[PDB]
Structure formats: structure tokens, C-alpha cells
Ligand SMILES: [K+]
Ligand SMILES: [K+]
Ligand code: NI
């Protein structure tokens with residue numbers, strides 16, 4: 533389960549994809565729990581990028597896929613609850629909670645995230661997740677930045 | 679007391695759609711937010727809280743939320759005690775369903791240390807009747823703290 537924060541909009545539509553791009557992203561999200569870089573990479577354009585901002589950016593489609601793969605080595609998504617999704621000028625935004633589990637220790641933690649996606653022809657030409665890395669490491673005892 | 683350590687210039691990221699347009703206010707609420715951003719460099723909580731509704735909240739997600747206008751101002755004012763906005767740059771602004779989104783860079787100075795850092799922020803704003811009923815900034819707190827030696831957590 534994921535209880536929904538008091539501050540989450542009570543507009544019934546703020547959770548639902550409103551546009552094509554948004555449907556995609558929501559699906560991509562749904563596909564994240566596959567924990568499969570090779571599968572996930574599909575949503576991406578050739579000319580793309582990716583970054584969990586506390587960590588370094590990955591440019592180009594195969595870097596992106598490779599970063600994904602390496603992450604999936606120590607951790608796995610158990611759940612993605614997306615509270616708000618919105619869009620303007622070709623970028624899509626998601627406020628969600630990712631339930632991530634750390635493979636080495638088995639502990640999981642509910643990470644508060646706000647991501648931006650850049651799409652071009654339904655192709656993810658960009659993906660950037662903003663969150664606090666430290667409280668995650670501390671929770672599941674899995675360091676990722678020295 | 680330490681001298682003021684060298685502000686770092688704001689870089690246009692490889693991914694920041696030049697374009698912009700994409701960084702311009704396309705809607706009324708957006709123009710409001712863009713204006714609120716402008717106000718932040720005033721480092722004046724009194725100026726800022728007048729953008730808020732009574733039913734409102736404020737949270738830097740690595741830090742505790744403030745609910746209610748009264749708690750919001752205490753938070754804002756408290757931050758301005760140890761910290762100061764030198765600049766804010768918004769690459770991407772957008773909006774749907776009553777929420778505005780800003781992908782921006784915050785240039786902050788730690789008052790006690792004189793040191794400066796550029797925080798990569800993605801923040802979301804909820805508005806109502808033209809007033810901020812919610813404000814949440816997402817970023818990594820540790821990389822900021824270490825950069826300028828201002829531990830804030832707890
Ligand atoms: K929506
Ligand atoms: K815009
Ligand atoms: Ni000292």
C-alpha cells in the first residue's frame with residue numbers, strides 16, 4: 533500500500549493521463565516494475581538522456597539503457613503510485629512515490645519523487661527524476677554516492 | 679565569519695530546450711509562479727507569504743512540511759535566517775489540472791559559511807483563485823549541505 537499525502541490535489545483528473553504523451557509515461561511507469569532495462573529502454577528515442585539527479589546524467593540511448601541495467605542490479609521497483617501528472621510544451625511531469633527495494637539488504641523504502649519527461653513523437657527524448665538520495669540510502673542501507 | 683565564496687554561474691544544461699517559449703508563462707497561473715520565483719531573491723518572507731492562501735502548505739521534501747500559512751511563513755523566515763537566494767533560473771514551466779511545474783536552478787548562499795551552490799530543483803505549485811495552496815521543491819539535500827557546509831536536516 534501507499535497512503536496518499538494530505539497535500540495531494542483532490543481534483544479527480546490530476547492522476548489520470550490527459551493526453552497521449554501522458555498515457556505513455558503512465559504506462560512506462562507501469563512498466564518500471566518489470567525491472568527490465570532492455571524492455572524499459574524501448575520507450576526512448578535514439579537521441580535521449582536520463583538522470584536521477586543526485587547521480588550523474590546518462591546521454592544517448594545505450595548509456596541510458598546501461599544506467600538502468602546497473603541500477604536494476606542492486607535495486608528493484610516494487611510499486612509506482614503517481615499522484616499528479618501534467619504537461620505543457622512537449623515535457624511531461626509526474627509527482628509520485630516509488631517503492632524501491634534494495635537487493636543486498638532486502639529493506640524497502642517509499643521515495644518521494646518528482647520527474648520530468650521529454651517526448652518527441654511518443655519517444656522519450658528525456659527523463660529526469662528529482663529526489664533526496666540520502667534518506668533512501670539511510671533507510672535501506674545501500675550507499676550510492678560517496 | 680567567512681568571506682563570501684564565489685557564486686557559480688548558471689549553466690544551460692544539454693537538455694534544457696533552448697526554444698523557450700518552453701520556459702515562458704503560457705497561462706495566468708504560470709505568470710504568477712514565474713513572478714513568485716522573481717520574488718525569491720528578495721529574501722523577504724513578508725513579501726513572499728502574501729502569495730499564499732490560508733489553506734496552504736510548503737515543503738522542501740528532504741525537510742519537514744509546513745501546513746497552513748502561519749507555519750509556512752515560519753519555515754520561509756527560518757530558512758532566510760541561514761540562507762539566501764542569489765538567483766533562480768527556470769528552464770521549463772508548465773501546467774495542468776491546477777498545478778504548475780518548474781524545472782529550475784536555484785543559486786543559494788549559506789550565510790554562516792559564505793559559501794554558494796547551484797541546486798537543481800524540480801518544484802510543483804498548486805493554485806486556487808490565483809493563490810498558492812501548495813509548494814513542494816524536489817532536490818538532493820546532501821549535495822547542497824556538503825557543498826556549502828550547512829547541515830540543515832533535523
Ligand atoms: K492529469
Ligand atoms: K510554458
Ligand atoms: Ni565557524
Ligand code: NI
Nearest residue numbers: 679680681792
Ligand atoms: Ni574563509
